[PDB]
Amino acid sequence: MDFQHRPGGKTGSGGVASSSESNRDRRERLRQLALETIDINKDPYFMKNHLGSYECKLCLTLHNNEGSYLAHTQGKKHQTNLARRAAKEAKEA
Amino acid sequence: GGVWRNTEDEILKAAVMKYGKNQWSRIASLLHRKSAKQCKARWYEWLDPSIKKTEWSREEEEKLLHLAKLMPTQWRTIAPIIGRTAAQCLEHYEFLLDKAAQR
Amino acid sequence: WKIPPCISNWKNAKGYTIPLDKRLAADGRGLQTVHINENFAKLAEALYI
Amino acid sequence: AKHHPDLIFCRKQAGVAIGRLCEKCDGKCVICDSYVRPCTLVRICDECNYGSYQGRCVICGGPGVSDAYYCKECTIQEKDRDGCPKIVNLGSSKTDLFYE
Amino acid sequence: DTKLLILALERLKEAYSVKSRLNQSQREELGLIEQAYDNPHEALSRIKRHLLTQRA
Amino acid sequence: NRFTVAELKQLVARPDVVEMHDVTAQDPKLLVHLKATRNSVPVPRHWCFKRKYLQGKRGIEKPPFELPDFIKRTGIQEMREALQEKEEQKTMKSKMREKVRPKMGKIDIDYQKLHDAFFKWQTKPKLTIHGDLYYEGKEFETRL
RNA sequence: CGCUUCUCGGCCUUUUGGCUAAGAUCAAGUGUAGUAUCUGUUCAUCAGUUUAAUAUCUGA
RNA sequence: UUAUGUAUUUACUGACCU
Ligand SMILES: [Mg+2]
Ligand SMILES: [Zn+2]
Ligand SMILES: [Zn+2]
Ligand SMILES: [Zn+2]
């Protein structure tokens, strides 16, 4: 044997996990990803509810996963129909 | 198949925003269907923020119709020269303009 | 005598440092100064005729 | 069953013939379709127990092994005092799977 | 015509006789080979579609 | 054919229930008799709405759940939150390592405390009588 | 009062440091019956149809 | 701003299934 040039591994490793634990970790990882991206975007309308789903709060729209929320940033422009609420906020420009 | 719907395009935009450019296995590690080859292929083929994916000009069309006569195939050699550069946006231009020069 | 930060593709160091700009990080990451020699034309139609 | 909503029961008068369940479905209740608390034997009609159809599974129509039962929750709701619970039609499952 | 697609699939399926094969790339390569087997006319129309109109 | 809420409200011995739709029934007098019979409960409020009975619970964020007190006096919430918080720090390396070399006795609380909490310390909750049907707000009208 | 320099604080990249061959590799799911939710998408006066009430047809 | 019709993913249900 090449004890030097064999593909190494460490003792007591426990091994690489099955598909269920791997893609559960993928969903938690992707949750942390989308949370930090909306934190960098400083979005004040992202809400996560009592069961791990996502809501456009001005929109009042539900979203199963992360890319269902952050692909709801383009349609149904209440995002600029808050110009009416800004006109109620201030009667001028 | 490589269908590339929107809920993976926007996650790819977030991943390239986080991880980087020459690091694709680490962002194919969160897409459940895609490999890193397909991630490179889309982010340089469709999602690159330098891609001017609309606005067909008039200077680039008179450019390409006697740039795709110099080297008649080869829309990956003349894609950076045109700079429309998606290499099939050029092929869209060339087939549309040879429909409109035929009708 | 000040230095820009590092906008690497692998860092594994202090700050990976993403502003909004400084993403292309080159001229355009590619240029060929005329991008084509014109003799291509003097070949191509020469075969065409 | 409750899972496949298009399965229809026989519902004729229950005779003296005791129902049977296949080896794949032993312990299943027939109506509520669970495993615990079996309380009451199954009596099936004479048309759904004739000749070739004797000792055959109530649900699957496979060869029966053990006797069939209702739950206590089917018993005290008196879902055993309706017709015979012999599932008649085979529809839209274990047919297309046979064609697959 | 089918008699040439069968040759191409044999000449490509020959490259997989050991089976410590890779994560996707060559498993999806032989997945493409056996999908070309189980419907030769689907692949044989895809070849003509690829072969008139795709040049990038 | 459909005599209106005026006369239909005039005929009935209890006119205080006849509504704007009860004229549009197919038998009005018995409908407002059974609507005014003694201990019935009414049709839910959302039979005429457009919102599928609870899709108005959109943007309000609510607390997770209050455990009842006899369960909280077993310490199960503190042990369970502690090991959830300790498990949120683990990587897949140690989540797969302590899948095959498991440390046990993480909770090991006792059996007498749990038996006492369900049997000695059982609390009757605050129930309600059979009329008090549920509508959509119903807990944000706590003003009564 | 104004101007330049110095020092203390209120502070807006700090990731575990470096180098090798990006160190090196990897990453399979079905079929069935049903729902929920995004995105795309569009929304002139009678008469009877219909509906709890409302909203198609026809009428000038 | 409730809402439709659809193209259309994503989630979810039934101890569904060799
Ligand atoms: Mg080692
Ligand atoms: Zn039962
Ligand atoms: Zn029968
Ligand atoms: Zn059976």
Q: Is residue B2 located within the same domain as residue B45?
A: yes
Count CB neighbours of A18 within 10 A.
9
Residue (of A93, A23, A37) closest to A70 by Cα position: A37
> B14: which residues sit within 8 A by CB, 6+ positions away?
A33, A34, A37, A70
Helix (H) or strand (E) holding D18: strand D17-18
Looking at chain D, list the stretches that DSSP marks H as alpha helix, in order from N- to C-terminal side: 72-75
Q: Is residue B40 located within the same domain as residue B8?
A: yes
Option in B35, B37, B75 nearest E56 (CB) = B75
**Residues B11/A66, Cβ–Cβ less than 8 Å:** yes
Quote the tokens at residue A79: 């995002």
From CA D5, how far away is CA C40, in angstroms rounded?
Answer: 72
Q: What is the whole-number distance in angstroms between the Cα of residue D62 and the centre of ligand 4?
A: 6
With an 8 Å CB cutoff and a minimum of 3 pairs, decide whether chains E and B touch.
yes
Count CB neighbours of F39 within 10 A.
6
**CA of B43, closest CA in chain C: separation in Å?**
14
CA D85 from chain centre, in angstroms, equals 5
CA-to-CA dists, residue F31 to B48, F3, F12, F14, F25, angstroms:
67, 14, 11, 12, 8
Put simply, the answer to whether A14 touches F62 (Cβ < 8 Å) is no
Contacts with C10 from chain B: Cβ below 8 Å = 20, 22-23
Q: Are strands D38-41 and D69-71 parallel, antiparallel or unpaired?
A: antiparallel
What would you measure as the largest C-alpha separation in chain F, in angstroms?
Answer: 81
The three-state secondary structure class of C40 is helix
**CA of B3, closest CA in chain A: separation in Å?**
16
**Residues D66/D21, Cβ–Cβ less than 8 Å:** yes
Residue (of C12, F12, B23, B12) closest to A30 by Cα position: B12
The residue whose CA lies nearest the C1' of nucleotide G30 is D100
Number of compact structural domains in chain D? 1
Radius of gyration of chain E (CA): 13
**Residues B28/A24, Cβ–Cβ less than 8 Å:** no
CA-to-CA dists, residue B39 to C8, D42, F8, F15, angstroms:
20, 60, 71, 71
The residue whose CA lies nearest the C1' of nucleotide G17 is C13
> B4: which residues sit within 8 A by CB, 6+ positions away?
B38, B42, B46
Residues 1-56 in E contacting B (C-alpha not used; CB under 8 Å): 23-25, 55-56
Residue with tokens 């080859």: B37
- Any E CB within 8 A of B33 CB: no
Q: Is residue B70 located within the same domain as residue B89?
A: yes
In chain F, where are the structural domains located? 1-58, 59-127
Residue (of D86, D4, D99) closest to D46 by Cα position: D86
Number of compact structural domains in chain B? 2
Q: Which of residues 9-38 of B touch strand G (CB under 7 A)?
A: 22-26, 28-29, 33, 35-36
Residue (of E13, E4, E3, E11) closest to E35 by Cα position: E13
Contacts with C44 from chain B: Cβ below 8 Å = 69-72
Quote the tokens at residue A52: 């791990």
Quote the tokens at residue C9: 């593709």
- Any E CB within 8 A of B91 CB: yes
Q: Is residue B33 located within the same domain as residue B56?
A: no
The residue whose CA lies nearest the C1' of nucleotide G53 is F21
From CA D16, how far away is CA F68, in angstroms rounded?
Answer: 52
With an 8 Å CB cutoff and a minimum of 3 pairs, decide whether chains B and A touch.
yes
From CA D85, how far away is CA F110, in angstroms rounded?
Answer: 47
Q: Is residue B101 located within the same domain as residue B73?
A: yes
Radius of gyration of chain D (CA): 13
Domain around D51: 1-100
**Residues E45/E7, Cβ–Cβ less than 8 Å:** no
Nearest nucleotide to D25 by CA–C1' distance? H15
Domain around B27: 1-51
Q: Quick one: F20 exposed, middle or buried, by C-beta within 10 A (0-12, 13-18, 19+)?
A: exposed
From CA B84, how far away is CA C40, in angstroms rounded?
Answer: 21
Residue (of D84, D89, D72, D87) closest to D18 by Cα position: D84
Technique behind the model: cryo-EM
- Taking CB atoms within 8 Å and a gap of at least 24, the contacts of B81-86 are B81/C35, B81/C36, B83/B52, B84/B52, B84/B60, B85/B50, B85/B51, B86/B45, B86/B46, B86/B51, B86/B53
From CA C47, how far away is CA F144, in angstroms rounded?
Answer: 95
Residue with tokens 């502690």: F82
Q: Are strands A54-56 and A61-63 parallel, antiparallel or unpaired?
A: antiparallel
> A10: which residues sit within 8 A by CB, 6+ positions away?
none
**Residues E16/E26, Cβ–Cβ less than 8 Å:** yes
Known binder of ligand: residue D74? yes
Residue (of F70, F72, F81, F82) closest to F120 by Cα position: F70
The residues whose Cβ lies within 5 A of ligand 2, an ion, are: D 29, 31-32, 71, 74
**Residues A75/A68, Cβ–Cβ less than 8 Å:** no
Per the document, the length of chain C is: 49
Q: Which of B65, B67, B70 to mutate to test the interface with C (most CBs of C within 10 A)?
A: B70
